[PDB]
Amino acid sequence: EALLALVAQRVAAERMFFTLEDGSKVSLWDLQQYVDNNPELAALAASVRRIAVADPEDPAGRPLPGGGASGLDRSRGLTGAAHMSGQEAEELELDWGQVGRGALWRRRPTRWLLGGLDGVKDWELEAYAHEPLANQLLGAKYGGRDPRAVVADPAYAADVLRAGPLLGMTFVLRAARDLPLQEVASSWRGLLGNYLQRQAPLSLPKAVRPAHLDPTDLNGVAWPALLSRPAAAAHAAAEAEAAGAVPDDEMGVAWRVQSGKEAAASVAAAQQLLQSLPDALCPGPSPAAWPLTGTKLVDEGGRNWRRGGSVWVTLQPEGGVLVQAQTGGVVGEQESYLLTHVQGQEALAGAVMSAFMGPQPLDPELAAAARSVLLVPANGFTAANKERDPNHPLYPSFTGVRPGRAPRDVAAYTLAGGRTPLLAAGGPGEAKLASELRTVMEAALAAAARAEEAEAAEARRARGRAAAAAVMAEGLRRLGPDAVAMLERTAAEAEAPQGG
């Protein structure tokens, strides 16, 4: 009957598996039953009740010491956005850092009139980029250079427009008004059509490796094994030349050009998919049948979009545009909805990216701020100081040590033993200890050359690393802790800020 041989058989026996922790594989039917037909546990799940474990190896209970008040848990009473401590944002993925702020003005507030009493705001515009991918792309090419020269070059602007799907630029448009649905749909359709009429045939990436996430390890990913290969770069380049070999500088991406953004194709296809915005968001006249109704993203009648709701437009590679949304107010009551996800529409991703960070964007301040912030994750720092780096360009972490003022006393100054690090650089002691460290390193380089396709070369490099570590360690025990500090600062002030 109703696919009795097809909706049964446990959909290909549910031969797609997962992987939890210690290699245990579970079926998707089992996991779907766990989230669907196990609602008692879900009653606890939507109550944030604390339970606390017991120690299993203890004869007498003894509730295990936990600190569970994590950022998401404590933030459930806040409004708008959650709040973490940086380390918890480093965990739970959370790798899309903010690169720019903006606004979609109806009437732009003038500093004249009455302070700006004509300042009607339709949306608040924020742009977010994947910071590790921003580092890996814009940092190994545009890293260690003058940032003003980089942002002055029109090649950097072209590159941050081209590599936008690669960075996964997601734009959050938060409604600052009870906006009518038809007006917003017409405005977005008109703006995106205007930007589609100027989307010339331009450059897109091409795939260098297929597959990943086969239907047995849907929990797993291929990139850590790809980046921790026995030869890595050699293997990656070999894959590259067997398809699209990188022509650019140290960035990857082969960049096919022109035709990739076809005109009568995907551009016109997107000009039709935009026509199926006011017949997919505001269909035939019945404000209870319009898809976005009932949910908190609109009002009770569904006519207007409520103030505080946000629309998340993420530009995936291969022309994928993911439009999600999120209601406003208390985050403990916020509900997030996936609205649409289009794939293969290379004109939509390029048109949205041009509309946000183009030569004429929807907000020039947002485009300039995003293209200017992006060098901070490019230089291996992230937009917000999640790693608590003291040398951050903006929002640097402090050492937490009171600054010292030299007193006009004599009893405070004591001539103790060898318990001061060297602070005078360029002196005879520093120069002679640098010379002794130099001869120790030269002995290490000489000893690493006697340690005797690319996998055997990397094994030889590992053997040379072991011999160099042995010789350098013996030399550093011959020298002092000040020499250890000098080797540490020499290693620190020699690598590029990008981390290459």
Partner: peptide, 21 residues
């Protein structure tokens, strides 16, 4: 007294703003 049954969803926000009462 009057029969003008106006409909608006911002009146809920106004009633919530009457928490000052």
């Amino acid at each position: 007294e009057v029969l003008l049954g106006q409909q608006e969803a911002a009146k809920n926000v106004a009633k919530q703003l009457d928490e000052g009462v």
